[PDB]
Amino acid sequence: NAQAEEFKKYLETNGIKPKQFHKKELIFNQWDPQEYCIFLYDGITKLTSISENGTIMNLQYYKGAFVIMSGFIDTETSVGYYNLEVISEQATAYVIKINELKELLSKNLTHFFYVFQTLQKQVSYSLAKFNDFSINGKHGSICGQLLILTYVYGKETPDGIKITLDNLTMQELGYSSGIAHSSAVSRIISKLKQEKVIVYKNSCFYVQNLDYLKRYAPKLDEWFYLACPATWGKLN
Amino acid sequence: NAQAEEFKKYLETNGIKPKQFHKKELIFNQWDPQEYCIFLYDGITKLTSISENGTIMNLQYYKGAFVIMSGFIDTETSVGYYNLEVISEQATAYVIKINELKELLSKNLTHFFYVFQTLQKQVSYSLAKFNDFSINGKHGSICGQLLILTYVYGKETPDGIKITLDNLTMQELGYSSGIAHSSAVSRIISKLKQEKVIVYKNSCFYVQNLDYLKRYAPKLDEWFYLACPATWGKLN
DNA sequence: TTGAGGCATTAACATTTGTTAACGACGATA
DNA sequence: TATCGTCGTTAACAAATGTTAATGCCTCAA
């Protein structure tokens, strides 16, 4: 991304250098809140939360470049108790204290409307996901995530559309759609395969019937068409 | 309250006078997609979406002062095809064509951080609402949506916390929670009355054991503490 | 006064999803 | 080569929710 690269070197010009993280690491966590601004530049991460009884919940994924904030700008108070876990083999993110971003960004606007728009991307994405997940129950919740992972981690192949993901177990899908037991998620997929909407090939899932997932996740498909038109056009 | 007070003037001091709306009026709709930046000053509205199937979905509610984006501040394209229906007897707001917001907000950067912070309040809200609705299915969805209603529009009476709202018909909560048929939402609420949680008096809902809702809407309760603490304190 | 329409409640029944358990396939370790 | 643990399936039963229909309470309009 062009804007993300211009922002990259705008930080290094002010003493902000990249930290390196490895898989299973938490850049921040729900238990020791620090209000930072994370400019995830490279790597795949997931924003999670754990209930008081230990229930895991994957709220979404983040693929660099992108911006995540654990606290508000003006008040600098916590925005919420979440964990940003690194699921890729290794990730590179510029961690900057929230206090400094104010002054850094008051002296330059073109980088402000960049971080602002990523936030607009965040909002629209959250509502679209909430829209498709709340209507068709859990069936559509699985279908929704599979549509997101296809539009971001997918690519055309002869067998079907491959999803370039590792450590994508059954529980990880359930965590990302509200299912708690790995047997319920496998039961929904058993029929998605019997309806040949998807298929399993070694190390990955393959999507054959994209239009099926679209019906059970229209607003999400719409969001990719409106927010990430690049990735969207590569699958139609 | 105050950060939006000096904001309201900063708009009409540059040629943005307020337009007025009445009940059931749509400020922006999904079929006519036009990118504005609405600043709901006074009144209550609901952001809705209508599926090709004809299904209605209430994504959330908006109570002034607040900011609602219909397009991206850069590309000027629609963040999504939604409808902002006025459900109050009387609502005032300030519309800005999104192309005009850029200039208006690039010179005064104190009101820039204001709009940016409300965007963050939106993000956390969506992430929190998505967390609690996903764990406990529909039973929890109603407990969550209810909790939201008692903090924003709930005042204390000897009979409990009264949700001062018109309507709130069974179908309307179904749209907010994600249930299609009104008979089902009634089923759950018929149990919450038996469960000494809520009662229906004077054509309004009175909450008596909001802690029961906190257990089923933990992330949402945490959101009011960190984002709108004044609201949180009114009931704690 | 009667009669129409909407909202709330319940029923019953179908469908989905929650929950636990058992089986097998695979890898890893000694 | 045997054994332990992880994960993917399926079974079986329980709970929740989807779906439709019927009944009652209320307002409204003639």
Author numbering:
A (entry chain B), B (entry chain A): 2 to 237
The article reads:
The major regulator of virulence factors in L. monocytogenes is the transcription activator PrfA, a member of the Crp/Fnr family of regulators. PrfAWT is a homodimer in which each monomer consists of an N-terminal domain (residues 1 to 108) and a C-terminal DNA-binding domain (residues 138 to 237) linked by a long α-helix (αC, residues 109 to 137). Two α-helices in the C-terminal domain, αE (residues 170 to 178) and αF (residues 183 to 197), constitute the two helices of the typical HTH motif present in many prokaryotic transcription factors. Glutathione binding stabilizes the DNA-binding helix-turn-helix (HTH) motif in a conformation compatible with DNA-binding, thereby allowing expression of PrfA-regulated virulence factors.
In addition, we found three new PrfA mutants in the remaining three strains—Leu to His substitution at residue 140 (PrfAL140H), Ala to Gly substitution at residue 218 (PrfAA218G), and Ala to Val substitution at residue 94 (PrfAA94V). To gain a deeper understanding of the PrfA* mutant proteins, the crystal structures of purified PrfAL140H, PrfAL140F, and PrfAA218G were determined as individual proteins and in complex with the PrfA hly promoter DNA. Here, we show that all the PrfA* proteins identified in our screen had higher binding affinities to hly, actA, and hpt promoter sequences than the PrfAWT protein. The previously identified PrfAG145S protein showed the lowest equilibrium binding constant, i.e., strongest binding of all the mutants, followed by the PrfAA218G, PrfAL140H, and PrfAL140F proteins, respectively. However, when PrfA is bound to promoter DNA, both monomers are almost identical to each other in all of our PrfA mutants.
